[PDB]
Amino acid sequence: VQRLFQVKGRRVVRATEVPVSWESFNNGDCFILDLGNNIHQWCGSNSNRYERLKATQVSKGIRDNERSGRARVHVSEEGTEPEAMLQVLGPKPALPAGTEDTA
Numbered sequence: 001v002q003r004l005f006q007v008k009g010r011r012v013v014r015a016t017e018v019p020v021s022w023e024s025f026n027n028g029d030c031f032i033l034d035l036g037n038n039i040h041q042w043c044g045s046n047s048n049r050y051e052r053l054k055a056t057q058v059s060k061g062i063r064d065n066e067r068s069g070r071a072r073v074h075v076s077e078e079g080t081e082p083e084a085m086l087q088v089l090g091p092k093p094a095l096p097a098g099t100e101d102t103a
């Protein structure tokens with residue numbers, strides 16, 4: 001499996017599937033790169049607490065509800081991306097700031 005979710009919001013946080021590419025990322029939200037047996041929860045330096053919380057819920061939700069607990073969740077952030085993420089997405093470009101969330 002190879003899926004990528006954008007976890008964005010303030011008033012209401014939503015997790016939505018986006019193209020599996022670094023071009024979907026930004027430094028203002030959280031992202032979940034689902035690789036099947038491994039799930040990568042990445043949060044931008046400017047992400048908010050609501051997004052980080054929802055990112056944990058979605059990552060653990062995939063792990064427990066979709067994989068029956070047979071997956072490992074890896075938490076990272078800007079600068080600490082694991083090579084497993086880079087092996088799938090390629091080298092990381094400079095990321096845009098991200099769009100302000102709806103308050």
